[PDB]
Design a protein around this ligand. Structure first.
Ligand SMILES: Nc1ncnc2c1ncn2[C@@H]1O[C@H](COP(=O)(O)OP(=O)(O)OP(=O)(O)OP(=O)(O)OP(=O)(O)OC[C@H]2O[C@@H](n3cnc4c(N)ncnc43)[C@H](O)[C@@H]2O)[C@@H](O)[C@H]1O
Ligand SMILES: [Mn+2]
Ligand SMILES: [Zn+2]
Length: 217
């Protein structure tokens, strides 16, 4: 099962990816997470990606495609995989097609989680993450038991660097211009499936699981 989760910033990609991989046991490949890992390790790519991520811009295609190509060639991707946040430009999508062909694979579905921009704004500015364990909360939609305290480990909650309103507006703008044309690109290939992301988390997952069920049928 080869899947792509596509959505504008804050659509719920990570939230759903976690539920999907827990049910199937396939790897979760997130370009955003890979860039963050490189930043922490202090690698050349991490240092370059930091400047773009801090401003809410997209990391250049050549570099992004390169890290995905290296990740997909590993044996742990034999049973399938879930790409989260890649591709996000037409160039990345064209590259993904041949990258997959070279390893004898084809995408099954490109799941587009659709959410209105005004809602996306709120999804992101109110997000709080635990500094200790990475648990995610939301001040409006899913708050912690006690303010600024993680329910799981007691850790400090904080706001991601790129989640402030000004950076979010740039993120939504650039992703809208670059990612939206992908809806047409994948509709033409027949891989595109739309999911209404403005529903409670379990219902969004149910819609997704219903779609994935057609693969066993
Ligand atoms: N391919 C690429 N090419 C070039 N550059 C790239 C790249 N990929 C990455 N990058 C670079 O790296 C950066 C970061 O990438 P990335 O980390 O991938 O950021 P993103 O795509 O903007 O999206 P988010 O992670 O912020 O949100 P999400 O959709 O996963 O939502 P979540 O599930 O947490 O949910 C968000 C919030 O909403 C809440 N929530 C989720 N679902 C619901 C729901 N149904 N109802 C209510 N609340 C919900 C959650 O609790 C949470 O608080 C990019 O800006 C760019 O610089
Ligand atoms: Mn994410
Ligand atoms: Zn925690």
């Amino acid at each position: 099962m080869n899947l792509v989760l596509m959505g504008l910033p804050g659509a719920g990609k990570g939230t759903q990816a976690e539920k999907i991989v827990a049910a199937y046991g396939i790897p979760h490949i997130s370009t955003g997470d890979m860039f963050r890992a490189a930043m922490k390790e202090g690698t050349p790519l991490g240092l370059q990606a930091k400047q773009y991520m801090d401003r809410g811009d997209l990391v250049p295609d050549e570099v992004t495609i390169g890290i995905v190509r290296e990740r997909l060639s590993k044996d742990d991707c034999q049973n399938g995989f879930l790409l989260d946040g890649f591709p996000r430009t037409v160039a990345q999508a064209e590259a993904l097609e041949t990258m997959l062909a070279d390893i004898g694979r084809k995408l099954d579905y490109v799941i587009h989680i659709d959410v209105r921009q005004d809602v996306l704004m709120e999804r992101l500015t109110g997000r709080r993450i635990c500094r200790n364990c990475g648990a995610t909360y939301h001040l409006i939609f899913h708050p912690p038991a006690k303010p600024g305290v993680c329910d799981k480990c007691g850790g400090e909650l904080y706001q991601r660097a790129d989640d402030n309103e000004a950076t979010v507006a740039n993120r939504l703008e650039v992703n809208m211009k670059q990612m939206k044309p992908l809806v047409d690109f994948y509709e033409q290939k027949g891989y595109l499936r739309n999911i209404n992301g403005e529903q409670d988390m379990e219902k969004v997952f149910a819609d997704i699981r219903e779609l994935l069920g057609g693969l066993a049928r």
